């Protein structure tokens, strides 16, 4: 039961519920998410603040006593997880363009002291004409050191596992894990569940042969600095955005 929404939008098929939406004024297609709670209240507060071309935007929200309505950008290219599956490996020029998108989104979030802490291929949508980061369910504002161990372990930084306290740079660690997966088809820390944790805490970035023989040393160098165990020495999003591989 929308009302003010029906005057501005034309709801279509269905994909909490998700349905296609069409903006009357622009003829642009949008997604409408119908949600029937402090953690949900927190997530929408970030959605209102974050506006970047490499982030899935929240166009508007209507809050009613029974349910909650969100109109958001619709991306038809699917998530990076599915795209990685069919192609397996990407060219260096394609992958650096994606890192440009992800690092741009990360830099913007960190200028707001927001850590996403759920940066994985399923949450990166692909746009035909780009990447967009989404799902801020784990996102938060870094008032101090964080200690909760959340996120899909393959992309989780060693300080999260160590439980000694983490901050904004865990998003950079995930960005290096993704870029690594983009260039060779497999993650830098693999495990066999406990084995995965010792690989991350050791933090040894390797570039096996034959897979990494063609990839340039500029890419290996950047990936190394993104995947540093020393958080202070680990790259910031600005340092990623100024690297020659990204430009
Ligand atoms: C045709 O479009 C798609 C197809 C696939 N398939 C994946 C599976 N294979 C088998 C078939 C293709 C996956 C995603 C999309 N598009 C899409 N566009 C916008 C999203 C969104 N999904 N979802 C699901 C999100 C997923 C991750 C992060 C953010 C969002 C997010 O906030 N929104 C806005 C809202 F949620 F409101 F819909």
Numbering used by the authors: 382 to 396, 402 to 422, 430 to 522, 528 to 590, 594 to 648
Q: What wording appears in the published article?
A:
Doublecortin-like kinase 1 (DCLK1) is a multi-domain bi-functional protein that belongs to the protein kinase superfamily and the doublecortin (DCX) family within the microtubule-associated protein (MAP) superfamily. Doublecortin-like kinase 1 (DCLK1) is an understudied bi-functional kinase with a proven role in tumour growth and development. Multiple isoforms of DCLK1 exist, generated by alternative splicing. Here, we report the crystal structures of DCLK1 kinase domain in complex with DCLK1-IN-1 and its precursors.
To further probe the R4 position, an electronegative trifluoroethyl group was introduced instead of hydrophobic ethyl, which led to DCLK1-IN-137. To better understand the effect of this change, we crystallised DCLK1-KD in complex with DCLK1-IN-1 to 3.1 Å resolution. However, a striking feature of the DCLK1-KD:DCLK1-IN-1 structure, is an opening of the ATP binding site to accommodate the bulkier trifluoroethyl group. The specific orientation adopted by the trifluoroethyl group allows additional contacts with residues Val404, Ala417 and Met465. In addition, the N-lobe undergoes a twist that shifts the positions of the β strands between 2.5 and 3.5 Å. The region near the glycine loop also undergoes an upward shift by 5 Å (distance measured at the position of Cα of Ile396 located at the start of the glycine loop and Ala402 located at the end of the loop). Notably, the presence of the trifluoroethyl group disrupts the salt-bridge interaction between the β3 strand invariant lysine (Lys419) and the conserved the αC helix glutamate (Glu436). Interestingly, this opening creates a shallow pocket, which in our structure is occupied by an additional electron density seen in both copies of DCLK1 that could be attributed to a fragment of polyethylene glycol (PEG), a component of the crystallisation condition. Overall, these changes can account for the dramatically increased DCLK1-IN-1 selectivity for DCLK1 against ERK5, LRRK2 and BRD428 and raise the possibility that the space occupied by the PEG molecule could be further explored for the design of DCLK1 selective inhibitors.
